[PDB]
Design an enzyme around this catalytic site. Structure first.
Site, mmCIF file in Angstrom:
data_model
loop_
_atom_site.group_PDB
_atom_site.id
_atom_site.type_symbol
_atom_site.label_atom_id
_atom_site.label_comp_id
_atom_site.label_asym_id
_atom_site.label_seq_id
_atom_site.Cartn_x
_atom_site.Cartn_y
_atom_site.Cartn_z
ATOM 1 N N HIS A 176 1.464 10.925 -7.605
ATOM 2 C CA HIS A 176 -0.250 11.197 -7.207
ATOM 3 C C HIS A 176 -0.293 8.972 -7.479
ATOM 4 C CE1 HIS A 176 1.418 10.818 -12.207
ATOM 5 N NE2 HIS A 176 0.890 9.504 -11.469
ATOM 6 N N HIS A 179 0.900 -0.967 -0.056
ATOM 7 C CA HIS A 179 0.261 -0.190 -0.246
ATOM 8 C C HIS A 179 0.590 1.145 0.161
ATOM 9 C CE1 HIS A 179 0.521 -0.925 4.294
ATOM 10 N NE2 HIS A 179 0.402 0.740 4.518
ATOM 11 N N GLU A 183 -4.383 9.741 -10.619
ATOM 12 C CA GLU A 183 -4.534 9.567 -12.376
ATOM 13 C C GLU A 183 -5.632 8.934 -12.556
ATOM 14 O OE1 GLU A 183 -0.684 8.277 -14.078
ATOM 15 O OE2 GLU A 183 -1.297 8.846 -15.378
HETATM 16 NI NI NI Z 1 1.720 2.023 6.102
HETATM 17 NI NI NI Z 2 1.357 8.401 -12.934
#
Ligand code: NI
Ligand code: NI
Ligand code: NI
Lengths: 118, 128
Positions: free
Chosen positions: B74, B5, B122
């Site tokens: 992004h 993540h 994006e």
């Molecule tokens: Ni974390």
């Molecule tokens: Ni990108």
């Protein structure tokens, strides 16, 4: 629908790529130079972009550095052994925070190491 | 190894969660309050955390906002129809900083969304 990548701006692409391939086991998935925009993009990761989320590194040739805020947190990576990966990065000369470890890349971005299982 | 993540600090967790779950069709995978550290965290994604990368959202109780730098880029997400996602985020009140444009081959259908904290999302159309 799926998460494709997270993008980070780096002051030195070659230093960024050494960290992601030496301190971590990422593969260069693709690199692209754009002289018209004076920047380079590199995608690093594990599986193919078609199969998993990658890391996008942007290098604007004219920027000496970037002002990181306190909004962006970290990128978490699943590892087999947190202590080992951390020791290997420490031994290579990278900054480490002093089952879960924190490294920082050459630009100061934080990487969270999470031992597979937890 | 694999990417688990990306983490972002949000000024208002409820506003942030409404954007990711309502405008972007993500599901809430995890949520926990930590009074000892005075923060709450939430995990949002499309697949299970064991199968794919997720987005972690943190709100520190003693904060009303964050200084976003110029370093972070992004979060990119794959969509079935970028025009449809743009129209949907705009209908809910969110800002589309770059519209998808005319959908055609071999034009790159990319859109840019802004989340409630000003983080860039994006949108890349599947097939590109
Ligand atoms: Ni974390
Ligand atoms: Ni990108
Ligand atoms: Ni440079």
């Amino acid at each position: 629908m799926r998460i494709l990548h997270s993008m980070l701006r780096v002051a030195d692409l070659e230093a960024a790529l050494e960290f992601y391939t030496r301190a971590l086991d990422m593969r260069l998935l693709r690199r692209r130079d754009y002289p018209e925009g004076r920047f380079t993009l590199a995608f690093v990761g594990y599986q193919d972009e078609r199969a998993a989320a990658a890391l996008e590194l942007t290098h604007n040739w004219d920027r000496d550095g970037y002002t990181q805020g306190d909004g962006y947190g970290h990128l978490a990576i699943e590892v087999e052994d947190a202590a080992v990966t951390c020791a290997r990065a420490r031994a290579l000369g990278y900054r480490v925070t002093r089952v879960i470890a924190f490294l920082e890349d050459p630009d100061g971005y934080k990487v969270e190491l999470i031992q597979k299982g937890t």
